[PDB]
Design an enzyme around this catalytic site. Structure first.
Site: not given
Ligand SMILES: *[C@@H]1O[C@H](CO)[C@@H](O[C@@H]2O[C@H](CO)[C@@H](O[C@@H]3O[C@H](CO)[C@@H](O)[C@H](O)[C@@H]3O)[C@H](O)[C@H]2NC(C)=O)[C@H](O)[C@H]1NC(C)=O
Ligand SMILES: *[C@@H]1O[C@H](CO)[C@@H](O[C@@H]2O[C@H](CO)[C@@H](O)[C@H](O)[C@H]2NC(C)=O)[C@H](O)[C@H]1NC(C)=O
Ligand SMILES: *[C@@H]1O[C@H](CO)[C@@H](O[C@@H]2O[C@H](CO)[C@@H](O)[C@H](O)[C@H]2NC(C)=O)[C@H](O)[C@H]1NC(C)=O
Ligand SMILES: *[C@@H]1O[C@H](CO)[C@@H](O)[C@H](O)[C@H]1NC(C)=O
Lengths: 181, 592
Positions: B358, B488
């Site tokens: 991150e 997805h």
């Protein structure tokens, strides 16, 4: 004697840069040059120490506020958006530039868009020129009938200042001192 | 008399400024909703989104009004092309509405689509925190099976009709936009217009994916045989040594990740895998310390340390004070130089590792801020998590965490453990490469018309056995729609990123380790303390989307195109072991 200018509650936005002149040399730069708070203090064509010894023909104090990132622009031989379209300083500039973080004063939670800046201009400012016209910038060949549309844009946009911003995009005030010899 | 390019540039400058401002404002609006879920904040976030969305369409049309062929600055041209991709408004307005209704319904179904097993019907668990928590730790074939067809039957029947129309609309749009079909539209993303031997064409992508998968396949097979074998001792009546694997048993609702098979397929259960969470806990570490250690890592290679604004503004732990927020790791660029991270972290080795990618994102974000708004992103969809995973690799090195006091000096990882870990890596990492390539191959072919509706399921599963070496418990006809059961797919998300991103990471880590003169196995490299890699990592980090990702890459790793060698090389040790373990058994699937 010019203490009032620096500590003034609100500053002109850069395109309407404020010009104030001083007639009395009662005030000194002792308080200024010896100041922890000033983030920038580049004096061009003079010695910051030597200032107290001299007095000069005309003193000129222009104040306005810009993006942190853009403070580097206020200086001789500087080319940028602010120096091209907002406050060019002439190369042979003799004087002193001063600036300090103004985060706590000029940005509020949810933003303070009140300070503005000039985005386009058909040609560059002449040193210390002030242009506050609001006429639409006709980039295209097609002329714009006073409303922004395809290829003509309003030339004034507003700095968005939030407390959270990055420093470069944080808002600091500026004061420029001009000296006549 | 100002040329079209000139005039256009001027357009952009105005755009960038208007856009930056609005984006920041959405961004903040969205950040308050996230860190502070409140009815009001929801309202405000939607409103602000709506203005950003509206604005984007308006500007897109105008962009089209500058003729793309006329521009000569490729760097300019690239921002332009990117902007003027029409949305789903480059066709009928009466069609557009229909499409959004389809989509909202799908996600809608998928969102809350609950299933109920025959026994204890009233159970009827939900996909979110129900089935999934089963598929992960359930070794009952009957249980796992019912939880599998149910979902695939329930939403399938509903999703099949919707999906077909969905396809027709999207092809009409792609064709509208001078694209062959939706497939070719999604393959745009990897297009390079540098045109100085760095150019890239949506056709080359298919070839390149296929080729690399060809080179990966050996590895995959041996991983596959090994895992099949261990499973046999678990689900002995259903698996067949010369055949494929029944799907439901792969730990997830789909076999996207064989991660959950580790308990079943651990090579040496005697040697526990090294978990440094007890080290951290007993050292009275906190969230802040974790992130601070990260920061050092980046600094040590040469990267800047995080902004003051970052420590000040960011949310780094669940709010004690009864503020309900969804808690997932996120790395935000709020576009005015305000960068922040929103992982409500908890104390574990994993979180520690997470924060390094991150933060990796954030460092990327910071690196290209000098680039203009349009150019302010990593050169394609792979790079951003391709770079934010690479830090999680160096950061996990036993060398590295010994270095930061992760364990006792001279820990001496043995090969038993080393292989044990490598395998775990492979379940998730190599597990999904075929999964992914096969899926996007199905969709691509559908969109090009290469599959009729009645052959949909038949062609899908035929591909699954052939390429993924996976098979389905019950045959599925064209009433069943299975590929839509994946988020997805049924939430209109591109999917091949996962593949390309996975081949990217290792070319990176291999060039950075080769630059930090690391020696020995690639999986123990740790780049820390090396400015050499840092500077060269940056050099591409700064470009953002500004140069064709092919040039981006070639600067880092000396190659203009994907190569799988670093993947194979990273995993080479587990490879040889797998060939041994499979020396006396069959490698391969037989399709039936
Ligand atoms: C990256 O380079 C730095 C530069 O030295 C390394 O930091 C130092 O790492 C060593 C090894 O853990 C630590 O050594 C200890 O130093 C104390 C004196 O401060 C000494 O009494 C001990 O016997 C031991 O030698 C040292 O604490 C540490 N110093 C600092 C300022 O961080 C770092 O470990 C290197 N990391 C990697 C991954 O190469
Ligand atoms: C979380 O959100 C709520 C509502 O969105 C915030 O409540 C507001 O607080 C301000 C400051 O006192 C009031 O002026 C508003 O009237 C409140 N709005 C409503 C509708 O309750 C709350 O402050 C936020 N909490 C934080 C700081 O995260
Ligand atoms: C990141 O680390 C460097 C360490 O050199 C910081 O750079 C200087 O840090 C000292 C703090 O002792 C400051 O007095 C200097 O002003 C810093 N340099 C500059 C150019 O200002 C850097 O500031 C650190 N990170 C942050 C957020 O300050
Ligand atoms: C502004 O006000 C503060 C407090 O009165 C003072 O310290 C400062 O000197 C004032 N202005 C200047 C120009 O110094």
């Amino acid at each position: 004697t010019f203490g009032e200018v620096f500590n003034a509650t609100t500053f002109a936005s850069v395109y309407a840069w404020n010009r104030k002149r001083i007639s009395n040399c009662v005030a000194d730069y002792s308080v200024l040059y010896n100041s922890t708070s000033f983030s920038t203090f580049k004096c061009y064509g003079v010695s910051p120490t030597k200032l107290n010894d001299l007095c000069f023909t005309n003193v000129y104090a222009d104040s306005f506020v810009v993006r942190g990132d853009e403070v580097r622009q206020i200086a001789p031989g500087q080319t940028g958006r602010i120096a091209d379209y907002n406050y060019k300083l002439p190369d042979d500039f003799t004087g002193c530039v001063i600036a300090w973080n103004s985060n706590n004063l000029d940005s509020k939670v949810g933003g303070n868009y009140n300070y503005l800046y000039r985005l386009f201009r058909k040609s560059n400012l002449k040193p210390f020129e002030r242009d506050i016209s609001t006429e639409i910038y006709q980039a295209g060949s097609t002329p714009c009938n006073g409303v922004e549309g395809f290829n003509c844009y309003f030339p004034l946009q507003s700095y968005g200042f939030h407390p959270t911003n990055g420093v470069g995009y944080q808002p600091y005030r500026v004061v420029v001192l001009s000296f006549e010899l | 008399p100002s040329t079209i390019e000139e005039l256009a540039k001027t357009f952009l400058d105005k755009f960038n400024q208007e856009a930056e401002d609005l984006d920041h404002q959405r961004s903040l609006a969205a950040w308050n909703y996230n860190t502070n879920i409140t009815k009001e904040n929801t309202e405000k976030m939607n409103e602000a989104e709506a203005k950003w969305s509206a604005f984007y369409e308006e500007q897109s049309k105008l962009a089209k009004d500058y003729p793309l062929q006329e521009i000569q600055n490729f760097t300019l041209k690239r921002q332009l092309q990117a902007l003027q991709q029409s949305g789903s408004s480059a066709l009928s307005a009466n069609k557009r509405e229909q499409l959004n209704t389809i989509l909202n319904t799908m996600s809608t179904i998928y969102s809350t689509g609950k299933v109920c097993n025959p026994k204890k019907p009233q159970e009827c668990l939900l996909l979110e925190p129900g089935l999934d928590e089963i598929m992960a730790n359930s070794t009952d074939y009957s249980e796992r099976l019912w939880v599998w067809e149910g979902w695939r039957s329930e939403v399938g029947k509903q999703l099949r009709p919707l999906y077909e129309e969905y396809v027709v609309l999207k092809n009409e749009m792609a064709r509208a936009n001078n694209y062959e079909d939706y497939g070719d539209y999604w393959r745009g993303d990897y297009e390079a217009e540098g045109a100085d031997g760095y150019g890239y064409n949506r056709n080359q992508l298919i070839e390149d994916v296929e080729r690399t998968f060809a080179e990966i396949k050996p590895l995959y097979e041996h991983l596959h045989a090994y895992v099949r074998a261990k499973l046999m001792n678990t689900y002995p009546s259903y698996i067949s040594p010369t055949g494929c694997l029944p799907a439901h048993l792969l730990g997830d609702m789909w076999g996207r990740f064989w991660t959950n098979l580790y308990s079943l397929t651990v090579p040496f259960p005697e040697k526990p895998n090294i978990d440094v969470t007890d080290a951290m806990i007993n050292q009275n570490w906190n969230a802040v310390r974790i992130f601070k250690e990260a920061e050092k890592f980046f600094v040590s290679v040469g990267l800047p340390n995080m902004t003051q604004g970052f420590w000040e503004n960011s949310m780094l732990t669940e709010p004690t004070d009864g503020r309900k927020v969804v808690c997932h790791p996120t790395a935000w660029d709020l576009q005015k130089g305000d960068f922040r991270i929103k992982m409500c972290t908890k104390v574990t080795m994993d979180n520690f590792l997470t924060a390094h990618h991150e933060m990796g994102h954030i460092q990327y974000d910071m690196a290209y801020a000098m680039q203009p708004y349009l150019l302010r992103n990593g050169a394609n969809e792979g790079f951003h998590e391709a770079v934010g995973e690479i830090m999680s690799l160096s950061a996990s090195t036993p060398k590295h965490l010994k270095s930061i006091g992760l364990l006792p000096s001279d820990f001496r990882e043995d090969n038993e453990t080393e292989i044990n870990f490598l395998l775990k890596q492979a379940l998730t990492i190599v597990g999904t490469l075929p999964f992914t390539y096969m899926l996007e191959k199905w969709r691509w072919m559908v969109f090009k018309g290469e599959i009729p509706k009645d052959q949909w399921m038949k062609k899908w599963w035929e591909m699954k056995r052939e390429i993924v070496g996976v098979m389905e418990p019950v045959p599925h006809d064209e009433t069943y729609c299975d590929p839509a059961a994946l988020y997805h797919v049924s939430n209109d998300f591109s999917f091949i990123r996962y593949y390309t991103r996975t081949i990217y990471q290792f070319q990176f880590q291999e060039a950075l380790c080769q630059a930090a003169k690391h020696e020995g196995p690639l999986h123990k490299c740790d780049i820390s303390n090396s400015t050499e890699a840092g500077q060269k990592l940056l050099n591409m980090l700064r470009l953002g989307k500004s140069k064709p990702w092919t040039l981006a890459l070639e600067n880092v790793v000396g190659a203009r195109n994907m190569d799988v060698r670093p993947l194979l090389n990273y995993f080479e040790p587990l490879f040889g072991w797998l060939k041994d373990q499979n020396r006396n058994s069959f490698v391969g699937w037989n399709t039936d």
